[PDB]
């Protein structure tokens, strides 16, 4: 039988609006900023823009498998991978959001906790369309589809070929490195990229140009880029710069936030869409107001 790519139809949660996604937004945004202790003050945002992607990530444009439409990562298959290792946190974050708000989908819902993080951060603008549909658990693609780090800039490039993804679109999602850290029991990597850790910035860009690294062994005897600052790449993060293509767009983002911004929010939007068709009748992208918009 012949592999043809799977068609997945996007349909809007049934009577909802913009307002009733507001809502929802505006509900994790206001569970951002209360639940401020997580990760010693770092905060939930970075995580769910990590889970976000996790959810996305998977997607095989050959096959149309994986992606965020199906919400799979609820299945414990999908949720043990090796891979996601420490997002069981932002899930539970979410589960009580999921709770007050039963209509949404579990597609719509990680996705939009990483859109909410990345605005509530200070980011960029980033549209969203809603109408993912849970798919069930035989849908789960099997764990190993997510990139490792330990590795170069030819497999960085052949990796996000799959998801359809040329190397600027690379270089502006990796922009997020900007948050959180890496934590040693969850990926075998200790350590922040950068100082403002729950602020979504370019510096990111700012560190790989101008600190100094050093290659050195972890307590997990795996090796990353060090500098005297506290900070730290990883294999993949340094590849950015080893690869002169890729400089040459380390270069832009670090001199212009304003155009990371933009490629960004449309890369990170494109990541989040992969694999859907949304019917010619389909509602325009929502572009959620901030909570600082609404005076809340
Ligand atoms: C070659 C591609 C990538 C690799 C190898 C990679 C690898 C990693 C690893 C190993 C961690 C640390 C996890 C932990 O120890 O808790 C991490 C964290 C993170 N990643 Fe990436 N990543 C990649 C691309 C991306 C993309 C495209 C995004 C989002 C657009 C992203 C967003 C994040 C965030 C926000 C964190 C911090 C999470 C936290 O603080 O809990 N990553 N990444």
Redesign the pocket.
Same mark, same amino acid.
């Given at each position: 039988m012949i592999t043809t790519p799977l068609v997945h139809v996007a349909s809007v949660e049934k009577g909802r609006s913009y307002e009733d996604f507001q809502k929802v937004y505006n509900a994790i945004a206001l569970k951002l900023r209360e639940d401020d202790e997580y990760?010693n003050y770092?905060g939930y945002g970075? @995580?769910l @823009?990590?889970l976000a992607?996790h959810i996305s990530?998977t997607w095989d444009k050959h096959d149309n498998t994986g992606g965020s439409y199906g919400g799979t990562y609820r299945f414990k298959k999908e949720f043990n991978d090796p891979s996601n !290792?420490?997002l069981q946190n932002g899930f539970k974050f979410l589960e009580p959001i999921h709770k007050e708000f039963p209509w949404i989908s579990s597609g719509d819902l990680f996705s939009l906790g990483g859109v909410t993080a990345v605005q509530e951060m200070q980011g960029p603008k980033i549209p969203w369309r809603c109408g993912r549909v849970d798919t069930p658990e035989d849908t789960t693609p099997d764990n190993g589809r997510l990139?490792? !780090?330990d590795?170069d800039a030819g497999y @960085?490039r052949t990796?996000f070929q799959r998801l359809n993804m040329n190397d600027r679109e690379v270089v502006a999602?990796?922009g !997020?490195?900007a948050?959180?850290?890496?934590?040693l029991k969850?990926?075998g990597?200790e350590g922040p990229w950068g100082a403002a850790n729950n602020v979504f910035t370019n510096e990111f860009y700012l560190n790989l140009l101008n600190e100094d690294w050093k290659l050195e062994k972890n307590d997990a005897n795996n090796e990353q880029w060090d500098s005297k600052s506290g900070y730290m790449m990883?294999p993949?993060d340094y590849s950015l710069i080893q690869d002169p293509k890729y400089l040459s767009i380390v270069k832009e983002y670090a001199n212009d936030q304003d155009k990371f911004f933009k490629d960004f929010s449309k890369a990170?939007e494109k990541?989040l869409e992969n694999g859907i068709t949304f019917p010619k009748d389909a509602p325009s992208p929502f572009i959620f107001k901030t909570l600082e918009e609404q005076g809340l």
């Open positions: 990760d770092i970075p @995580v @823009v990590r992607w990530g !290792a420490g990139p490792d !780090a590795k @960085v990796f999602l990796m !997020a490195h948050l959180g850290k890496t934590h969850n990926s990597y990883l993949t990170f990541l």
